[PDB]
Amino acid sequence: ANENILKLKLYRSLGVILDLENDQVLINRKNDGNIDILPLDNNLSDFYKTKYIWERLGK
Amino acid sequence: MNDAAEVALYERLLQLRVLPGASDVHDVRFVFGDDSRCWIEVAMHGDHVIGNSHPALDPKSRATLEHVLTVQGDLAAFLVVARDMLLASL
Ligand code: NA
């Protein structure tokens, strides 16, 4: 264990999973077989991506 | 990428930074957004989990947050409510 190792466990515990193999992020809030998939495309703004993720966590 | 870089991407995506708290007791500081604008400190263990925050929150709000953490045991839900409350307090 180091500090980043723990930070990563903490982020993952929120249900947000980096899927960089596929240039996307997964959001698994309900653990019910449904996920949101957010492309990492430069196209959407950082602001829009952040807003979207917090909306998904708030469900 | 290495762990620090993955950490950096989570911070970018969530605009959420996890820092050492100023408190001995509430030793995890969650920082929201692009500055030191919204933050709340919590203890990862105990009955008394809610520490200081910037914007200061009223007791009724702090009790709501405490229960999401202690009773619901749901960190994501706690961060959602705390972020909403802190942003609304700016
Ligand atoms: Na920390």
Curated annotation (Swiss-Prot), chain A:
Predominant place of localization? nucleus
What functional role does this protein have? Acts as a component of the essential kinetochore-associated NDC80 complex, which is involved in chromosome segregation and spindle checkpoint activity.
Q: Which UniProt keywords apply?
A: Acetylation, Cell cycle, Cell division, Centromere, Chromosome, Coiled coil, Kinetochore, Mitosis, Nucleus
Which species expresses this protein natively? Saccharomyces cerevisiae (strain ATCC 204508 / S288c) (Baker's yeast)
Question: What is the protein's given name?
Answer: Kinetochore protein SPC24
Tell me where it resides: Nucleus; Chromosome, Centromere, Kinetochore
Annotated GO biological processes are: cell division; centromere clustering; chromosome segregation; sister chromatid biorientation
- Additional remark text: Present with 1750 molecules/cell in log phase SD medium.
Record-level GO cellular component terms: kinetochore; Ndc80 complex; nucleus; outer kinetochore
From Swiss-Prot, chain B:
Top-rank taxon, per record: Eukaryota
The record's subcellular locations are: Nucleus; Chromosome, Centromere, Kinetochore
What else is noted? Answer: Present with 3280 molecules/cell in log phase SD medium.
Q: Which family does it belong to?
A: Belongs to the SPC25 family.
> Quaternary structure?
Component of the NDC80 complex, which consists of TID3/NDC80, NUF2, SPC24 and SPC25. The NDC80 complex is formed by two subcomplexes, TID3/NDC80-NUF2 and SPC24-SPC25, which are joined end-to-end through their coiled-coil domains. It has a rod-like structure with a length of 570 Angstroms and globular domains at either end. The TID3/NDC80-NUF2 globular domains are probably directed to microtubules, the SPC24-SPC25 globular domains to the centromere.
Q: What does the protein in this record do?
A: Acts as a component of the essential kinetochore-associated NDC80 complex, which is involved in chromosome segregation and spindle checkpoint activity.
What's the name of the protein? Kinetochore protein SPC25
Query: What species is this protein from?
Result: Saccharomyces cerevisiae (strain ATCC 204508 / S288c)
Q: Which gene encodes it?
A: SPC25
Covered part of the full sequence, start to end and full length, is: 133 to 221 of 221
